[PDB]
Amino acid sequence: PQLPEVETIRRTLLPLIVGKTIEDVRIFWPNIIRHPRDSEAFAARMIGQTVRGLERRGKFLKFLLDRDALISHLRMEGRYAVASALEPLEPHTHVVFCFTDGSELRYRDVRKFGTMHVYAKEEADRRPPLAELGPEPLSPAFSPAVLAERAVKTKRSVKALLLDCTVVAGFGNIYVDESLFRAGILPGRPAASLSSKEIERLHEEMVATIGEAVMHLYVYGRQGNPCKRCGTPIEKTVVAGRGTHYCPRCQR
DNA sequence: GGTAGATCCTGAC
DNA sequence: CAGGACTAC
Ligand SMILES: [Zn+2]
């Protein structure tokens, strides 16, 4: 799920778990647990704590408990569900939080790429994976000025820049490609080659694209098909190790 | 210190 | 072989 989807998850999941107390934590793929490194310590510390809140930073979910915070990233295909402990688990369920009311918060992930970190709440923001996270794309903290500053000081492509979580929080591949198309900028352009006008336009489109989503595609996954603006076949290449889609006429 | 590379997994082609 | 986010040149 991307940022907009994660925000939806945060909004919808909260009322389903708030006020519930953890009685057990069951882990079927320990590698998901990143801190404490020992999955048994992870499980033990959470028992007895009540869920008090749920926040989002970038694509990370932050579960607020009594003492600790649980920081969770779903990556490509991670999913949470709340269901009865009496029913069989769905396939690919790797972590389950059991509540005293007989309900469960279940984490599924066919790819097993998701991660979980638990720290005392006051530490969470100064530890991985939240430390160094850039500003929210929809916040004043993410401005053309901030974007321009990062762009001038790097030799990387503009796409590589936008994918950098330290530059802006949780801007996914799909939104990078879409934003770059809407701003009329080639993904392979050196970040430092962008004019002040192009930086301004890009920031504008980044906010509009992600902002619309939290509330059709031009290029992403449309390779070989006609551009919706000019009819030129959309092309796909690799930039910054990622599938990269663009229109060679609309983008320069 | 900045930046590329290795890292994980597995359904899919 | 793509996908998001610690090690070593
Ligand atoms: Zn076009």
PDB file of C-alpha atoms (C1' of nucleotides) and ligand atoms in Angstrom:
ATOM      1  CA  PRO A   1       0.000   0.000   0.000  1.00  0.00           C
ATOM      2  CA  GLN A   2       1.089   3.580  -0.703  1.00  0.00           C
ATOM      3  CA  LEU A   3       0.831   6.633   1.565  1.00  0.00           C
ATOM      4  CA  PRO A   4      -2.836   7.334   0.761  1.00  0.00           C
ATOM      5  CA  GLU A   5      -3.725   3.694   1.470  1.00  0.00           C
ATOM      6  CA  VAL A   6      -1.724   3.746   4.706  1.00  0.00           C
ATOM      7  CA  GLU A   7      -3.593   6.852   5.828  1.00  0.00           C
ATOM      8  CA  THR A   8      -6.853   5.021   5.128  1.00  0.00           C
ATOM      9  CA  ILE A   9      -5.603   2.058   7.161  1.00  0.00           C
ATOM     10  CA  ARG A  10      -4.677   4.342  10.050  1.00  0.00           C
ATOM     11  CA  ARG A  11      -8.126   5.953   9.986  1.00  0.00           C
ATOM     12  CA  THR A  12     -10.113   2.719   9.712  1.00  0.00           C
ATOM     13  CA  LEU A  13      -7.999   0.486  11.964  1.00  0.00           C
ATOM     14  CA  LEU A  14      -7.914   2.807  14.996  1.00  0.00           C
ATOM     15  CA  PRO A  15     -11.519   2.401  16.188  1.00  0.00           C
ATOM     16  CA  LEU A  16     -11.183  -1.374  15.756  1.00  0.00           C
ATOM     17  CA  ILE A  17      -8.305  -1.651  18.245  1.00  0.00           C
ATOM     18  CA  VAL A  18      -8.342   1.431  20.484  1.00  0.00           C
ATOM     19  CA  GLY A  19      -8.808   0.588  24.161  1.00  0.00           C
ATOM     20  CA  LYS A  20      -7.997  -3.100  23.679  1.00  0.00           C
ATOM     21  CA  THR A  21      -5.381  -4.770  25.886  1.00  0.00           C
ATOM     22  CA  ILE A  22      -2.764  -7.166  24.519  1.00  0.00           C
ATOM     23  CA  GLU A  23      -2.803 -10.609  26.144  1.00  0.00           C
ATOM     24  CA  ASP A  24      -0.455 -12.411  23.755  1.00  0.00           C
ATOM     25  CA  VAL A  25       1.760 -11.800  20.737  1.00  0.00           C
ATOM     26  CA  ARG A  26       2.373 -14.677  18.348  1.00  0.00           C
ATOM     27  CA  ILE A  27       5.130 -14.585  15.752  1.00  0.00           C
ATOM     28  CA  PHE A  28       5.365 -17.044  12.870  1.00  0.00           C
ATOM     29  CA  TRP A  29       8.124 -15.283  10.924  1.00  0.00           C
ATOM     30  CA  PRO A  30      10.621 -13.721  13.385  1.00  0.00           C
ATOM     31  CA  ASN A  31      12.530 -11.864  10.649  1.00  0.00           C
ATOM     32  CA  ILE A  32       9.694  -9.319  10.511  1.00  0.00           C
ATOM     33  CA  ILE A  33      10.698  -8.255  14.031  1.00  0.00           C
ATOM     34  CA  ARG A  34      13.561  -5.757  13.787  1.00  0.00           C
ATOM     35  CA  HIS A  35      13.665  -4.392  17.347  1.00  0.00           C
ATOM     36  CA  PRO A  36      14.087  -5.729  19.879  1.00  0.00           C
ATOM     37  CA  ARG A  37      16.163  -8.100  17.737  1.00  0.00           C
ATOM     38  CA  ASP A  38      14.876 -11.010  19.825  1.00  0.00           C
ATOM     39  CA  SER A  39      11.285 -11.738  18.788  1.00  0.00           C
ATOM     40  CA  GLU A  40      10.612 -13.205  22.241  1.00  0.00           C
ATOM     41  CA  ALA A  41      11.482  -9.863  23.860  1.00  0.00           C
ATOM     42  CA  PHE A  42       9.265  -8.086  21.329  1.00  0.00           C
ATOM     43  CA  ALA A  43       6.324 -10.303  22.284  1.00  0.00           C
ATOM     44  CA  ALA A  44       6.928 -10.198  26.046  1.00  0.00           C
ATOM     45  CA  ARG A  45       7.120  -6.419  26.379  1.00  0.00           C
ATOM     46  CA  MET A  46       3.844  -5.785  24.552  1.00  0.00           C
ATOM     47  CA  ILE A  47       1.759  -8.073  26.759  1.00  0.00           C
ATOM     48  CA  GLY A  48      -0.396  -6.137  29.217  1.00  0.00           C
ATOM     49  CA  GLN A  49      -0.300  -2.903  27.227  1.00  0.00           C
ATOM     50  CA  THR A  50      -3.439  -1.217  25.914  1.00  0.00           C
ATOM     51  CA  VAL A  51      -3.728   0.383  22.473  1.00  0.00           C
ATOM     52  CA  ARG A  52      -4.138   4.137  22.930  1.00  0.00           C
ATOM     53  CA  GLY A  53      -3.660   5.551  19.437  1.00  0.00           C
ATOM     54  CA  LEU A  54      -2.557   5.094  15.842  1.00  0.00           C
ATOM     55  CA  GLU A  55      -0.571   7.638  13.858  1.00  0.00           C
ATOM     56  CA  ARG A  56       1.111   7.706  10.459  1.00  0.00           C
ATOM     57  CA  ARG A  57       4.494   9.001   9.354  1.00  0.00           C
ATOM     58  CA  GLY A  58       5.240   8.552   5.670  1.00  0.00           C
ATOM     59  CA  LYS A  59       4.241   4.960   4.963  1.00  0.00           C
ATOM     60  CA  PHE A  60       4.930   3.908   8.571  1.00  0.00           C
ATOM     61  CA  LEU A  61       2.128   3.197  11.017  1.00  0.00           C
ATOM     62  CA  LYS A  62       2.819   4.096  14.644  1.00  0.00           C
ATOM     63  CA  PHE A  63       0.732   2.133  17.137  1.00  0.00           C
ATOM     64  CA  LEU A  64       0.715   3.983  20.456  1.00  0.00           C
ATOM     65  CA  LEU A  65       0.410   1.761  23.527  1.00  0.00           C
ATOM     66  CA  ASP A  66       0.734   2.512  27.247  1.00  0.00           C
ATOM     67  CA  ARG A  67       4.523   2.651  27.398  1.00  0.00           C
ATOM     68  CA  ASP A  68       5.715   1.556  23.958  1.00  0.00           C
ATOM     69  CA  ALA A  69       5.161   2.469  20.332  1.00  0.00           C
ATOM     70  CA  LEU A  70       4.961  -0.173  17.608  1.00  0.00           C
ATOM     71  CA  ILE A  71       6.381   1.093  14.307  1.00  0.00           C
ATOM     72  CA  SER A  72       5.115  -0.945  11.349  1.00  0.00           C
ATOM     73  CA  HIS A  73       5.827  -0.830   7.599  1.00  0.00           C
ATOM     74  CA  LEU A  74       3.776  -2.987   5.217  1.00  0.00           C
ATOM     75  CA  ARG A  75       6.026  -2.572   2.171  1.00  0.00           C
ATOM     76  CA  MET A  76       4.431  -3.901  -1.023  1.00  0.00           C
ATOM     77  CA  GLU A  77       1.725  -6.281   0.151  1.00  0.00           C
ATOM     78  CA  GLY A  78       1.477  -6.153   3.949  1.00  0.00           C
ATOM     79  CA  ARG A  79      -2.049  -6.051   5.383  1.00  0.00           C
ATOM     80  CA  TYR A  80      -3.704  -5.711   8.798  1.00  0.00           C
ATOM     81  CA  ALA A  81      -7.050  -7.210   9.789  1.00  0.00           C
ATOM     82  CA  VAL A  82      -9.037  -7.450  13.020  1.00  0.00           C
ATOM     83  CA  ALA A  83     -10.858 -10.736  13.595  1.00  0.00           C
ATOM     84  CA  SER A  84     -11.914 -13.394  16.104  1.00  0.00           C
ATOM     85  CA  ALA A  85      -9.370 -15.687  17.759  1.00  0.00           C
ATOM     86  CA  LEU A  86     -11.910 -18.485  17.216  1.00  0.00           C
ATOM     87  CA  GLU A  87     -11.547 -18.421  13.428  1.00  0.00           C
ATOM     88  CA  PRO A  88      -8.735 -19.930  11.323  1.00  0.00           C
ATOM     89  CA  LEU A  89      -5.972 -17.516  10.324  1.00  0.00           C
ATOM     90  CA  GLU A  90      -5.755 -16.457   6.685  1.00  0.00           C
ATOM     91  CA  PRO A  91      -2.755 -17.630   4.612  1.00  0.00           C
ATOM     92  CA  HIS A  92       0.564 -15.799   5.059  1.00  0.00           C
ATOM     93  CA  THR A  93      -0.229 -14.526   8.564  1.00  0.00           C
ATOM     94  CA  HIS A  94       3.105 -13.749  10.212  1.00  0.00           C
ATOM     95  CA  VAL A  95       2.317 -11.780  13.379  1.00  0.00           C
ATOM     96  CA  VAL A  96      -0.805 -11.788  15.545  1.00  0.00           C
ATOM     97  CA  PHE A  97      -1.631  -9.504  18.452  1.00  0.00           C
ATOM     98  CA  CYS A  98      -4.169 -11.196  20.722  1.00  0.00           C
ATOM     99  CA  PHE A  99      -6.450  -8.958  22.806  1.00  0.00           C
ATOM    100  CA  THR A 100      -8.160  -9.804  26.111  1.00  0.00           C
ATOM    101  CA  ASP A 101     -11.566  -9.526  24.424  1.00  0.00           C
ATOM    102  CA  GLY A 102     -10.898 -12.531  22.197  1.00  0.00           C
ATOM    103  CA  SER A 103     -10.219 -10.421  19.107  1.00  0.00           C
ATOM    104  CA  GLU A 104      -6.906 -10.218  17.235  1.00  0.00           C
ATOM    105  CA  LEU A 105      -4.920  -7.776  15.145  1.00  0.00           C
ATOM    106  CA  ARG A 106      -3.378  -9.867  12.378  1.00  0.00           C
ATOM    107  CA  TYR A 107      -0.510  -8.991  10.070  1.00  0.00           C
ATOM    108  CA  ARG A 108      -0.360 -10.790   6.715  1.00  0.00           C
ATOM    109  CA  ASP A 109       2.311 -10.420   4.046  1.00  0.00           C
ATOM    110  CA  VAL A 110       2.782 -12.898   1.202  1.00  0.00           C
ATOM    111  CA  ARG A 111       6.190 -11.357   0.454  1.00  0.00           C
ATOM    112  CA  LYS A 112       7.353 -11.099   4.088  1.00  0.00           C
ATOM    113  CA  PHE A 113       9.000  -7.733   3.400  1.00  0.00           C
ATOM    114  CA  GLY A 114       7.225  -5.844   6.178  1.00  0.00           C
ATOM    115  CA  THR A 115       9.008  -4.676   9.324  1.00  0.00           C
ATOM    116  CA  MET A 116       8.162  -4.020  12.977  1.00  0.00           C
ATOM    117  CA  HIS A 117      10.114  -2.023  15.576  1.00  0.00           C
ATOM    118  CA  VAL A 118       9.054  -1.486  19.204  1.00  0.00           C
ATOM    119  CA  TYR A 119      10.537   1.195  21.476  1.00  0.00           C
ATOM    120  CA  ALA A 120       9.472   3.213  24.492  1.00  0.00           C
ATOM    121  CA  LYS A 121       7.223   5.891  22.972  1.00  0.00           C
ATOM    122  CA  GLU A 122       9.617   8.748  23.755  1.00  0.00           C
ATOM    123  CA  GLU A 123      12.402   7.001  21.810  1.00  0.00           C
ATOM    124  CA  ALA A 124      10.497   6.012  18.669  1.00  0.00           C
ATOM    125  CA  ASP A 125      11.058   9.273  16.781  1.00  0.00           C
ATOM    126  CA  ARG A 126      14.830   9.286  17.372  1.00  0.00           C
ATOM    127  CA  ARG A 127      15.416   5.649  16.397  1.00  0.00           C
ATOM    128  CA  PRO A 128      15.089   3.639  13.178  1.00  0.00           C
ATOM    129  CA  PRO A 129      13.086   3.505  11.092  1.00  0.00           C
ATOM    130  CA  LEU A 130      11.561   6.924  11.889  1.00  0.00           C
ATOM    131  CA  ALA A 131      14.794   8.803  12.536  1.00  0.00           C
ATOM    132  CA  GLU A 132      15.867  10.903   9.544  1.00  0.00           C
ATOM    133  CA  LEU A 133      12.434  10.570   7.930  1.00  0.00           C
ATOM    134  CA  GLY A 134      11.769  13.648   5.807  1.00  0.00           C
ATOM    135  CA  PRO A 135       8.721  15.930   6.130  1.00  0.00           C
ATOM    136  CA  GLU A 136       5.197  14.870   5.194  1.00  0.00           C
ATOM    137  CA  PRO A 137       4.542  15.732   1.529  1.00  0.00           C
ATOM    138  CA  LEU A 138       1.261  17.419   2.508  1.00  0.00           C
ATOM    139  CA  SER A 139       2.770  19.570   5.269  1.00  0.00           C
ATOM    140  CA  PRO A 140       4.223  23.113   5.178  1.00  0.00           C
ATOM    141  CA  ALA A 141       7.511  21.473   6.192  1.00  0.00           C
ATOM    142  CA  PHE A 142       7.746  20.143   2.638  1.00  0.00           C
ATOM    143  CA  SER A 143       8.196  23.284   0.559  1.00  0.00           C
ATOM    144  CA  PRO A 144       9.655  24.176  -2.847  1.00  0.00           C
ATOM    145  CA  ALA A 145      12.529  25.741  -0.899  1.00  0.00           C
ATOM    146  CA  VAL A 146      13.282  22.487   0.921  1.00  0.00           C
ATOM    147  CA  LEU A 147      13.073  20.524  -2.328  1.00  0.00           C
ATOM    148  CA  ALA A 148      15.316  23.021  -4.117  1.00  0.00           C
ATOM    149  CA  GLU A 149      17.900  22.768  -1.331  1.00  0.00           C
ATOM    150  CA  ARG A 150      18.176  18.988  -1.649  1.00  0.00           C
ATOM    151  CA  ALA A 151      18.154  19.154  -5.452  1.00  0.00           C
ATOM    152  CA  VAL A 152      21.123  21.516  -5.784  1.00  0.00           C
ATOM    153  CA  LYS A 153      23.348  19.545  -3.408  1.00  0.00           C
ATOM    154  CA  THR A 154      23.129  16.168  -5.156  1.00  0.00           C
ATOM    155  CA  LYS A 155      24.375  14.537  -8.357  1.00  0.00           C
ATOM    156  CA  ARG A 156      21.536  12.002  -8.440  1.00  0.00           C
ATOM    157  CA  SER A 157      18.550  12.014 -10.786  1.00  0.00           C
ATOM    158  CA  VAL A 158      15.357  13.837  -9.830  1.00  0.00           C
ATOM    159  CA  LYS A 159      13.574  10.485  -9.514  1.00  0.00           C
ATOM    160  CA  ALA A 160      16.229   9.149  -7.139  1.00  0.00           C
ATOM    161  CA  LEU A 161      15.795  12.331  -5.107  1.00  0.00           C
ATOM    162  CA  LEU A 162      12.023  11.974  -4.739  1.00  0.00           C
ATOM    163  CA  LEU A 163      12.358   8.305  -3.758  1.00  0.00           C
ATOM    164  CA  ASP A 164      14.669   9.309  -0.900  1.00  0.00           C
ATOM    165  CA  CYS A 165      12.752   8.992   2.377  1.00  0.00           C
ATOM    166  CA  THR A 166      15.027  11.635   3.946  1.00  0.00           C
ATOM    167  CA  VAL A 167      13.891  14.167   1.339  1.00  0.00           C
ATOM    168  CA  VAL A 168      10.149  13.575   1.645  1.00  0.00           C
ATOM    169  CA  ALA A 169       8.209  10.993   3.651  1.00  0.00           C
ATOM    170  CA  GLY A 170       6.774   7.978   1.847  1.00  0.00           C
ATOM    171  CA  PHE A 171       6.550   9.169  -1.757  1.00  0.00           C
ATOM    172  CA  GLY A 172       6.172   5.907  -3.657  1.00  0.00           C
ATOM    173  CA  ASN A 173       7.322   4.888  -7.132  1.00  0.00           C
ATOM    174  CA  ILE A 174       3.872   5.328  -8.673  1.00  0.00           C
ATOM    175  CA  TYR A 175       3.494   8.881  -7.381  1.00  0.00           C
ATOM    176  CA  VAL A 176       7.038   9.818  -8.379  1.00  0.00           C
ATOM    177  CA  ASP A 177       6.375   8.822 -11.996  1.00  0.00           C
ATOM    178  CA  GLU A 178       2.922  10.430 -12.049  1.00  0.00           C
ATOM    179  CA  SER A 179       4.163  13.663 -10.460  1.00  0.00           C
ATOM    180  CA  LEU A 180       7.095  13.916 -12.866  1.00  0.00           C
ATOM    181  CA  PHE A 181       4.788  13.441 -15.844  1.00  0.00           C
ATOM    182  CA  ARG A 182       2.351  16.063 -14.564  1.00  0.00           C
ATOM    183  CA  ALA A 183       5.260  18.462 -14.010  1.00  0.00           C
ATOM    184  CA  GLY A 184       6.653  17.731 -17.483  1.00  0.00           C
ATOM    185  CA  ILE A 185      10.044  16.598 -16.204  1.00  0.00           C
ATOM    186  CA  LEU A 186      12.036  13.555 -17.349  1.00  0.00           C
ATOM    187  CA  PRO A 187      12.765  11.151 -14.448  1.00  0.00           C
ATOM    188  CA  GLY A 188      16.392  10.764 -15.534  1.00  0.00           C
ATOM    189  CA  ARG A 189      17.106  14.494 -15.357  1.00  0.00           C
ATOM    190  CA  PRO A 190      19.863  15.348 -12.883  1.00  0.00           C
ATOM    191  CA  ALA A 191      18.141  16.804  -9.817  1.00  0.00           C
ATOM    192  CA  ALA A 192      20.508  19.775  -9.969  1.00  0.00           C
ATOM    193  CA  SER A 193      19.540  20.564 -13.572  1.00  0.00           C
ATOM    194  CA  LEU A 194      16.029  21.598 -12.522  1.00  0.00           C
ATOM    195  CA  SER A 195      15.274  25.315 -12.730  1.00  0.00           C
ATOM    196  CA  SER A 196      13.501  27.203  -9.951  1.00  0.00           C
ATOM    197  CA  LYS A 197      10.414  27.081 -12.157  1.00  0.00           C
ATOM    198  CA  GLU A 198      10.690  23.308 -12.558  1.00  0.00           C
ATOM    199  CA  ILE A 199      11.189  22.839  -8.812  1.00  0.00           C
ATOM    200  CA  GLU A 200       8.108  24.956  -8.132  1.00  0.00           C
ATOM    201  CA  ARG A 201       6.042  23.020 -10.667  1.00  0.00           C
ATOM    202  CA  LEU A 202       7.266  19.658  -9.372  1.00  0.00           C
ATOM    203  CA  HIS A 203       6.419  20.471  -5.749  1.00  0.00           C
ATOM    204  CA  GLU A 204       2.996  21.636  -6.908  1.00  0.00           C
ATOM    205  CA  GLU A 205       2.340  18.385  -8.775  1.00  0.00           C
ATOM    206  CA  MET A 206       3.701  16.210  -5.960  1.00  0.00           C
ATOM    207  CA  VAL A 207       1.260  17.795  -3.515  1.00  0.00           C
ATOM    208  CA  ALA A 208      -1.629  17.664  -5.984  1.00  0.00           C
ATOM    209  CA  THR A 209      -1.040  14.029  -6.956  1.00  0.00           C
ATOM    210  CA  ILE A 210      -0.658  12.613  -3.447  1.00  0.00           C
ATOM    211  CA  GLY A 211      -3.283  15.017  -2.100  1.00  0.00           C
ATOM    212  CA  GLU A 212      -5.856  13.889  -4.650  1.00  0.00           C
ATOM    213  CA  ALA A 213      -5.141  10.247  -3.812  1.00  0.00           C
ATOM    214  CA  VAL A 214      -5.756  10.667  -0.075  1.00  0.00           C
ATOM    215  CA  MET A 215      -9.178  12.030  -1.033  1.00  0.00           C
ATOM    216  CA  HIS A 216      -6.610   7.433 -13.344  1.00  0.00           C
ATOM    217  CA  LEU A 217      -2.909   7.104 -14.165  1.00  0.00           C
ATOM    218  CA  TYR A 218      -0.993   8.942 -16.888  1.00  0.00           C
ATOM    219  CA  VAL A 219       2.172   6.849 -17.153  1.00  0.00           C
ATOM    220  CA  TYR A 220       2.588   4.246 -14.413  1.00  0.00           C
ATOM    221  CA  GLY A 221       2.170   0.764 -15.878  1.00  0.00           C
ATOM    222  CA  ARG A 222       0.996   2.258 -19.170  1.00  0.00           C
ATOM    223  CA  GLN A 223       4.089   1.485 -21.253  1.00  0.00           C
ATOM    224  CA  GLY A 224       3.321   0.848 -24.919  1.00  0.00           C
ATOM    225  CA  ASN A 225       0.009   2.673 -24.597  1.00  0.00           C
ATOM    226  CA  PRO A 226      -0.765   6.179 -25.939  1.00  0.00           C
ATOM    227  CA  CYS A 227      -0.083   9.133 -23.659  1.00  0.00           C
ATOM    228  CA  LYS A 228      -3.425  10.530 -22.498  1.00  0.00           C
ATOM    229  CA  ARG A 229      -2.229  14.067 -23.252  1.00  0.00           C
ATOM    230  CA  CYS A 230      -0.341  13.756 -26.548  1.00  0.00           C
ATOM    231  CA  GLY A 231      -0.875  10.199 -27.819  1.00  0.00           C
ATOM    232  CA  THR A 232       2.837   9.352 -27.846  1.00  0.00           C
ATOM    233  CA  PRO A 233       3.537   5.787 -26.665  1.00  0.00           C
ATOM    234  CA  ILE A 234       4.486   5.717 -22.992  1.00  0.00           C
ATOM    235  CA  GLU A 235       7.942   4.251 -22.447  1.00  0.00           C
ATOM    236  CA  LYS A 236       9.439   2.269 -19.576  1.00  0.00           C
ATOM    237  CA  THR A 237      13.062   2.119 -18.452  1.00  0.00           C
ATOM    238  CA  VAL A 238      15.027   1.662 -15.241  1.00  0.00           C
ATOM    239  CA  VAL A 239      16.003   4.699 -13.172  1.00  0.00           C
ATOM    240  CA  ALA A 240      17.447   4.403  -9.669  1.00  0.00           C
ATOM    241  CA  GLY A 241      16.854   0.653  -9.912  1.00  0.00           C
ATOM    242  CA  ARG A 242      13.104   1.154 -10.271  1.00  0.00           C
ATOM    243  CA  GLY A 243      10.619   0.596 -13.069  1.00  0.00           C
ATOM    244  CA  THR A 244      10.273   4.053 -14.567  1.00  0.00           C
ATOM    245  CA  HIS A 245       7.463   5.204 -16.849  1.00  0.00           C
ATOM    246  CA  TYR A 246       7.344   8.440 -18.818  1.00  0.00           C
ATOM    247  CA  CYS A 247       6.170  10.208 -21.961  1.00  0.00           C
ATOM    248  CA  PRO A 248       9.137  11.274 -24.118  1.00  0.00           C
ATOM    249  CA  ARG A 249       7.128  14.175 -25.583  1.00  0.00           C
ATOM    250  CA  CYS A 250       5.395  15.699 -22.544  1.00  0.00           C
ATOM    251  CA  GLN A 251       8.463  15.316 -20.320  1.00  0.00           C
ATOM    252  CA  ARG A 252      11.801  17.044 -20.908  1.00  0.00           C
TER     253      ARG A 252
ATOM    254  C1'  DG B   1      29.826  12.168   4.071  1.00  0.00           C
ATOM    255  C1'  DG B   2      27.455  11.083  -0.336  1.00  0.00           C
ATOM    256  C1'  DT B   3      26.031   7.218  -3.289  1.00  0.00           C
ATOM    257  C1'  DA B   4      25.769   2.717  -5.242  1.00  0.00           C
ATOM    258  C1'  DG B   5      25.088  -1.875  -3.776  1.00  0.00           C
ATOM    259  C1'  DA B   6      23.433  -5.860  -1.034  1.00  0.00           C
ATOM    260  C1'  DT B   7      19.357  -7.026   1.678  1.00  0.00           C
ATOM    261  C1'  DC B   8      15.052  -9.710   2.066  1.00  0.00           C
ATOM    262  C1'  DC B   9      10.914 -13.065  -0.428  1.00  0.00           C
ATOM    263  C1'  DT B  10       8.071 -15.119  -3.547  1.00  0.00           C
ATOM    264  C1'  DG B  11       4.339 -14.881  -7.291  1.00  0.00           C
ATOM    265  C1'  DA B  12       4.804 -14.094 -11.898  1.00  0.00           C
ATOM    266  C1'  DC B  13       6.584 -14.226 -16.572  1.00  0.00           C
TER     267       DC B  13
ATOM    268  C1'  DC C   1      13.509 -10.054 -11.300  1.00  0.00           C
ATOM    269  C1'  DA C   2      10.832  -5.865  -9.071  1.00  0.00           C
ATOM    270  C1'  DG C   3       9.719  -3.770  -4.589  1.00  0.00           C
ATOM    271  C1'  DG C   4      11.152   0.097   0.257  1.00  0.00           C
ATOM    272  C1'  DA C   5      14.175   1.332   3.213  1.00  0.00           C
ATOM    273  C1'  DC C   6      22.531  -1.214   6.572  1.00  0.00           C
ATOM    274  C1'  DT C   7      27.411  -1.889   4.595  1.00  0.00           C
ATOM    275  C1'  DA C   8      31.106  -0.263   2.128  1.00  0.00           C
ATOM    276  C1'  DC C   9      33.370   2.122  -1.871  1.00  0.00           C
TER     277       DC C   9
HETATM  278 ZN    ZN D   1       2.615  12.908 -23.717  1.00  0.00          ZN
END
